[PDB]
Design a protein around this motif. Structure first.
Motif, mmCIF file in Angstrom:
data_model
loop_
_atom_site.group_PDB
_atom_site.id
_atom_site.type_symbol
_atom_site.label_atom_id
_atom_site.label_comp_id
_atom_site.label_asym_id
_atom_site.label_seq_id
_atom_site.Cartn_x
_atom_site.Cartn_y
_atom_site.Cartn_z
ATOM 1 N N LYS A 31 -29.883 43.818 34.991
ATOM 2 C CA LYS A 31 -28.582 43.617 34.475
ATOM 3 C C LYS A 31 -28.783 44.491 33.216
ATOM 4 O O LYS A 31 -27.901 45.315 32.908
ATOM 5 C CB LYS A 31 -28.186 42.230 33.883
ATOM 6 N N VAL A 32 -29.891 44.213 32.220
ATOM 7 C CA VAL A 32 -30.317 45.079 31.164
ATOM 8 C C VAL A 32 -30.345 46.713 31.607
ATOM 9 O O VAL A 32 -29.675 47.282 30.860
ATOM 10 C CB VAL A 32 -31.634 44.612 30.544
ATOM 11 N N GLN A 33 -30.771 46.892 32.685
ATOM 12 C CA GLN A 33 -30.885 48.323 33.195
ATOM 13 C C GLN A 33 -29.649 48.925 33.213
ATOM 14 O O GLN A 33 -29.543 50.141 32.981
ATOM 15 C CB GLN A 33 -31.854 48.599 34.390
ATOM 16 N N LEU A 34 -28.751 48.296 33.621
ATOM 17 C CA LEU A 34 -27.545 48.717 34.166
ATOM 18 C C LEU A 34 -26.804 49.002 32.864
ATOM 19 O O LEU A 34 -26.013 50.176 32.482
ATOM 20 C CB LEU A 34 -26.650 47.807 34.991
ATOM 21 N N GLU A 35 -26.796 48.072 31.870
ATOM 22 C CA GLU A 35 -26.246 48.209 30.605
ATOM 23 C C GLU A 35 -27.037 49.310 29.838
ATOM 24 O O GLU A 35 -25.857 49.962 29.106
ATOM 25 C CB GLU A 35 -26.435 46.912 29.811
ATOM 26 N N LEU A 36 -28.074 49.532 30.108
ATOM 27 C CA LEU A 36 -28.611 50.564 29.410
ATOM 28 C C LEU A 36 -28.347 51.957 29.942
ATOM 29 O O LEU A 36 -27.882 52.795 29.244
ATOM 30 C CB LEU A 36 -30.272 50.470 29.549
ATOM 31 N N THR A 37 -28.037 51.948 31.160
ATOM 32 C CA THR A 37 -27.675 53.365 31.906
ATOM 33 C C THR A 37 -26.254 53.708 31.389
ATOM 34 O O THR A 37 -26.040 54.762 30.915
ATOM 35 C CB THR A 37 -27.484 53.222 33.347
ATOM 36 N N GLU A 38 -25.368 52.611 31.419
ATOM 37 C CA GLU A 38 -23.865 52.820 30.836
ATOM 38 C C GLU A 38 -24.027 53.460 29.453
ATOM 39 O O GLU A 38 -23.356 54.282 29.062
ATOM 40 C CB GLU A 38 -23.272 51.745 30.889
ATOM 41 N N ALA A 39 -24.824 52.828 28.648
ATOM 42 C CA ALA A 39 -24.610 53.035 27.330
ATOM 43 C C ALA A 39 -25.321 54.709 27.000
ATOM 44 O O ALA A 39 -24.797 55.339 26.312
ATOM 45 C CB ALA A 39 -25.681 52.317 26.381
ATOM 46 N N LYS A 40 -26.392 55.204 27.912
ATOM 47 C CA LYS A 40 -26.971 56.367 27.891
ATOM 48 C C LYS A 40 -25.760 57.335 28.277
ATOM 49 O O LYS A 40 -25.755 58.311 27.742
ATOM 50 C CB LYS A 40 -28.215 56.520 28.592
ATOM 51 N N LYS A 41 -25.103 56.824 29.270
ATOM 52 C CA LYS A 41 -24.115 57.829 29.752
ATOM 53 C C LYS A 41 -23.062 58.090 28.526
ATOM 54 O O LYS A 41 -22.469 59.129 28.547
ATOM 55 C CB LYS A 41 -23.379 57.367 31.051
ATOM 56 N N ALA A 42 -22.533 56.816 27.982
ATOM 57 C CA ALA A 42 -21.572 56.878 27.028
ATOM 58 C C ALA A 42 -22.031 57.882 25.865
ATOM 59 O O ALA A 42 -21.431 58.638 25.202
ATOM 60 C CB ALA A 42 -21.315 55.711 26.671
#
Lengths: 114, 114, 114, 114
Positions: A31-42
């Motif tokens: 879950k943390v990894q998914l949020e991190l990926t989304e934040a980096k993309k943003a």
């Protein structure tokens, strides 16, 4: 017949408890990894904007004006935070894998034919 | 009594495993289909806007200005992506239906009265 | 001992099936009712705005300009739709309550002491 | 053997029912607490804005202009509401803890060796 000693039956039970615990840690990590990926993309996307680009941010159900630099900073902080959290979970995961490795070895040694 | 051979009992078990697997593939397909329908609806609506219409897009919790042409392009890409995914899932589904058909036929042939 | 005839045991089973079916219909009805309440609240609020109020609407992840009258119209349509759906579900619910009433009466009549 | 009287077995069953009930109340309390924390964070942020800051609010899928003072007021009301709800749930929780305390004591007294 094969006679699994009570202490080994206990180890087998604990092995299953660790497996369930690892499953949870892995789900937390993902879950943390998914949020991190989304934040980096943003962040990647916001950083590509011209410095004078108009930017608004959401605050709950509200929308207020912000700036490119402020949004970038807030995203960097979010990423910083998620990475600290990700590392802690990966440390817990590594610990669980080692316990599973060691307990599996003990069970196999205990049940090994004489 | 009816005597289902161990090998046929195994086929019956695998038939149920395939059914559960198909149920999942179908759920995956339907999630993709829903997203695809929503994206097409959004594209339809954006395409109906005047070329000079003001358009903003969301980037995480942020809102930045974009244009009609850029939003249309990004939506076309999303749709392109979902359709590729949808086709792959439909290919998996078709494969599962065929395995279920063939295994059902084998079970019926094995249990058919002499 | 009390001897529940096989046909009454069947009625008892169907009664439970209807109860589960009603539970679902009620959950479907309540989801529709919640959406309807939210839509009415939104319409109430938009209608209170001055006629020249600035209004934007979301289209997926996009935001485009609209007008008070257009938003009001689209909300009226949403409400119209939800009410049609709500009525259909309430008709299904009423039918289920009647079947439960009638089947409960049949079971009680069948098991009534002579 | 230890002979748990039927009435104590009943108390043990009710103790478990209360535990499940408390678990639910606590989950309800925590959901309210999370929403309250988010609302307070949002208010804190909106209050830090300059008085003439531009603010928009969401109404369903729509976005309309509002003002700093109006958003602050609406957030204060949300917080007021959540705190009233939180207190009621905490009162229910306290009542459940007391019943669990008293019932646990009764069971221990009933099963205490003579």
């Amino acid at each position: 017949m094969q006679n699994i000693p009570p202490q080994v039956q206990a180890m087998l039970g604990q092995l299953e408890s660790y497996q369930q615990q690892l499953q949870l840690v892995v789900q937390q990590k993902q879950k943390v990894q998914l949020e991190l990926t989304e934040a980096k993309k943003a962040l990647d996307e916001i950083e590509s904007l011209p410095d004078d680009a108009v930017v608004y941010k959401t605050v709950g159900t509200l929308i207020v004006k912000t700036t490119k630099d402020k949004a970038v900073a807030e995203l960097k902080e979010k990423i910083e935070t998620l990475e600290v959290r990700l590392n802690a979970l990966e440390r817990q995961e590594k610990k669980l894998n080692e316990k599973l490795k060691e307990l599996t070895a003990q069970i196999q040694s205990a049940l090994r034919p004489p």
